[PDB]
Amino acid sequence: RPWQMKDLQAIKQEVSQAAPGSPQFMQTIRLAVQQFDPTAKDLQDLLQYLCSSLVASLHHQQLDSLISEAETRGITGYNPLAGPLRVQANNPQQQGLRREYQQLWLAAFAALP
Amino acid sequence: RPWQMKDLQAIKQEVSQAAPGSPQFMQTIRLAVQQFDPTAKDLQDLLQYLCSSLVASLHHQQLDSLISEAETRGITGYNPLAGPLRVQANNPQQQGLRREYQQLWLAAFAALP
Amino acid sequence: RPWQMKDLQAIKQEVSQAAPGSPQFMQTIRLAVQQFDPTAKDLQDLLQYLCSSLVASLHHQQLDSLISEAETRGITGYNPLAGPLRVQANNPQQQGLRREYQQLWLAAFAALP
């Protein structure tokens, strides 16, 4: 049951004033993601929806660095021989992957300033 | 039948102006808690959405003290050999613990100002 | 079809300007009660939601007076061998008791001033 249009518009409107990485932005986005459990595809939809392309690029760089760090350290069930981290997360049989991807996404978003 | 994004958005918006623990906030939060019948996990999510980390920490300490006294006295449904009240309240077959957790939560949050 | 968050939040939204006993307050309360046909549980929830604790206490004094008067006089389907009207209105198969309780509720609210 991925978010429809109205859910995403409520999400966008509530955070009009707050700048990326602010506590309010992070709070609301954390609620949304932890309520809907969206795969990487849908998180990309949301990120391209809310902020500009510059913020998306910054987030992508930060998320790539975080993926490298937390994948060399180790992940509970990351089998990197069966596809990249993004693809495994989007599989609906890899709940752990979805959870870790969501946490990495949120950390990268919070790590702008 | 857990709450959805719209319910949380309405709960936060209706009480944006008021202060934590004000009679208005207490009315709305008590109604939500008594209506949706949530466990500890959902209550933690709601608190993270509503108030900042400072208010979250203060409520955490106050609720720790309240749960401390309550379950140190001894409660009808609490069996300390299975886990902390935060975990028993998350099992849907322990509604007594869930209601006690809800009431300790609301009282603790009301005791802030 | 017991009311959710949205219904009660509306009710309080349009019962915010007026004061208890005023024509608007009673209009809205009577409409809601006549529509959802709520028992004593939901009625007490609605009252705790709407007004301060002082007004709720006053209303309950008036309601106890009305209920005592009616039980002395006699109710069509009230059988005191099982429990008070207070508890007889929670059973879904006692529509008469529930509607009588709703009417005493509305009267006691209308007679506050």
Numbering used by the authors:
A (entry chain C), B (entry chain A), C (entry chain B): 13 to 125
Paper text:
All retroviral Gag proteins contain three canonical domains: matrix (MA), capsid (CA), consisting of independently folded N-terminal (CA-NTD) and C-terminal (CA-CTD) domains, and nucleocapsid (NC). During immature virus particle formation, these domains function in membrane binding, viral lattice self-assembly and viral genomic RNA (vgRNA) packaging, respectively. Our results show that HTLV-1 uses a distinct CA-NTD arrangement to form the immature Gag lattice and that, in contrast to other retroviral structures, the CA-NTD is the key determinant of immature HTLV-1 assembly.
To analyze the structure of immature HTLV-1 lattice interfaces in more detail, we engineered an HTLV-1 Gag truncation construct for bacterial expression, purification, in vitro assembly and analysis by cryo-ET. The MA126CANC tubes exhibited varying helical parameters. Tubes were sorted into nine groups and each group was processed separately by subtomogram averaging. The two groups with the largest number of tubes had similar geometry and, thus, they were pooled and processed together. The resulting final reconstruction of the CA-NTD layer had an overall estimated resolution of 3.4 Å. The helical pitch and densities for large side chains were clearly visible at this resolution, which enabled us to build a refined model of the immature CA-NTD lattice interactions. The in vitro assembled tubes had the same arrangement of the CA-NTD layer as the full-length HTLV-1 Gag VLPs (Cα root-mean-square deviation (r.m.s.d.) = 1.2 Å), underscoring the biological relevance of our in vitro system. Specifically, CA-NTD residues M17 and Y61 have been identified as essential for immature HTLV-1 Gag lattice assembly and particle formation. In our model, these residues are located in helices 1 and 3, respectively, which form the hexamerization interface together with helix 2.
